[PDB]
Every structure is written in structure tokens, then in C-alpha cells.
């Protein structure tokens, strides 16, 4: 996340770490979001690797002990079927994967609340990303959480030609774009937290940003929409 600001441990429960075994160790390469005991939502090309993967939930800091995390590995990857890698923009930037055990729920451990099916935020919607990912463009992980606020900017904003034209699709959430704070790598598959009737309710997966960089003026980062596979998450979940 460019632009900032450290979390405080128990803001966002549901934020877990997607994490690599990368020799005697693990590295951090996404985010997700816990939405069942054993199930986390997270984004399709965070999987494109065939690499061993793990859970963390309930952690705060990257490099240190916080005294708050569970470990689990990952039993089955269910990627969206229509899912293609050269082509991010087309959509379908989504996966679920079931952890090998079931995490405990605790004030660091929560599942994720999802928006009901098709529902669009108006233009302007309040939202904050949560992450580990870079925190400039071309920079280096975050070790704490940070969050950052990235207000929505609609679908008919965000598909015109000085945003990111038909690259972005009705199926995304477009949020940011102010030039300072944004997502950036290390980001995806994130949450998107945004406030509605009082709650916050996850409506984005981290999906991508401009080549040009993270924080670039009139390129938001930009999201799966939630509200559009409201079916598909819980077709997956009822049938494994
Ligand atoms: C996500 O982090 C976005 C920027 C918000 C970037 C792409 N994702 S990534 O850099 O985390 C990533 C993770 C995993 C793979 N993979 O397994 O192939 C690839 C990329 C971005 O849009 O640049
Ligand atoms: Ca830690």
C-alpha cells in the first residue's frame, strides 16, 4: 500500500497473509480474506505459480513474532473457470482456497462480511485497502499492516478513456487514483473494506495497477467486484 498508514492490530480481522515456501522459509506474495473457518477468498493470479502455499491469519508484523498467528496450509485451490492469465483485464480474478484445518476465531481472527449479490457503491463510496504489498512503486514489502483510504470511483468514470478506458470492467471495483496513495504489488488478492449501513463489508479483491506504477493520477487500483460472484464463492463452498 503507497501512501499509508500502519494498522491497529484488530482493525481487520479477516485480512490474512498468502505466503510461499521459498527454501528453509516463507515469503509473503498476497493478500486474501477469510470468509469460512476454512475458507479464503483471494485473487486468481496470486496462483498462476505452482508453488506450495500457506495461510497466515492473525498477523500484524511480517518479521517478528506478535504472539496472535495461526498457520495453515493450503489443501485445494479453486480458481474461477473462465480465469486466463494473459488476460487480467478480461475478469474472473478470483480463487478460493480450503485451508487443511479450520482456524480458531478470535479478536485477530474474523471472518470477512461480503456485500450481498449485485449490490454497486455510488461514486465516491468510502473504502480502505489493507496490505502488506509495497509501500512505493518499485519499493520493497511493508513489515506492518497498513491501510489506506481509497474512495470509489465508478463505473462510468473508471472506463473512460483518461482512466483506464475497456480495460476496466463492470465486474471491478475501481478505488483511488489520486496519485498518492493506491495498492500496489504484494497487495492483490486483498481486501477491499468498505463502510455500508454501518458495517464494513468486504466489496474488492486487489486485482491490479497501472504498469506505470502504483500511485499514478486517474489509474485507481482496481478490483474484482465481490457483489458480482456472490454465487459462484457459495456454488464452490456447498460443493467441496
Ligand atoms: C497485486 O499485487 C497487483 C497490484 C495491486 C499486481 C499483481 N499481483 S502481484 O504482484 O502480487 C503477483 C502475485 C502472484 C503472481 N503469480 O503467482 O504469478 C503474480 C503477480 C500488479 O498488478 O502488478
Ligand atoms: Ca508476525
Keep these: 500500500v503507497v501512501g499509508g498508514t500502519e494498522a491497529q ?19 509473503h506474495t498476497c493478500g486474501g480474506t477469510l470468509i469460512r473457518q476454512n475458507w479464503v477468498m483471494t485473487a486468481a493470479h496470486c496462483v498462476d505459480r505452482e508453488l506450495t502455499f500457506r495461510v497466515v491469519v ?31 483485464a478480461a475478469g474472473y480474478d478470483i ?6 484445518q479450520s482456524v480458531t476465531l478470535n479478536s485477530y481472527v474474523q471472518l470477512g462480511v461480503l456485500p450481498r449479490a449485485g449490490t454497486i457503491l455510488a461514486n465516491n463510496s468510502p473504502c480502505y485497502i489493507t496490505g502488506w504489498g509495497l509501500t512505493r512503486t518499485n519499493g520493497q514489502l511493508a513489515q506492518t499492516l497498513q491501510q489506506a483510504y481509497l474512495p470509489t470511483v465508478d463505473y462510468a468514470i473508471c472506463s473512460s478513456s483518461s482512466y483506464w478506458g475497456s480495460t ?17 504489488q504484494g497487495d492483490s488478492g486483498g481486501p477491499l473494506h468498505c463502510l455500508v449501513n454501518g458495517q464494513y463489508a468486504v466489496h474488492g479483491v486487489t486485482s491490479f495497477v497501472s504498469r506505470l506504477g502504483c500511485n499514478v493520477t486517474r489509474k485507481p487500483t482496481v478490483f474484482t467486484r465481490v457483489s458480482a460472484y456472490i454465487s459462484w464463492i457459495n456454488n464452490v463452498i456447498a460443493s467441496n
Excluded at 9 to 24: A, H, K, M, V
Excluded at 62 to 85: F, S
Aim: net charge positive.
Design 168 to 184: 476496466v470492467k463492470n465486474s471491478m471495483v475501481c478505488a483511488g487514483g489520486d496519485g498518492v496513495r493506491s495498492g500496489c
Design 58 to 88: 492473525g498477523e500484524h508484523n511480517l518479521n517478528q513474532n506478535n504472539g496472535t498467528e495461526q498457520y495453515v496450509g493450503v489443501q485445494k485451490i479453486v480458481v474461477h473457470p473462465y480465469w486466463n492469465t494473459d488476460d487480467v
Design 95 to 100: 480463487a478460493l482456497l480450503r485451508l487443511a
Design 9 to 27: 492490530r484488530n482493525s481487520w480481522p479477516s485480512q490474512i497473509s498468502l505466503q510461499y515456501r521459498s527454501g528453509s522459509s516463507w515469503a
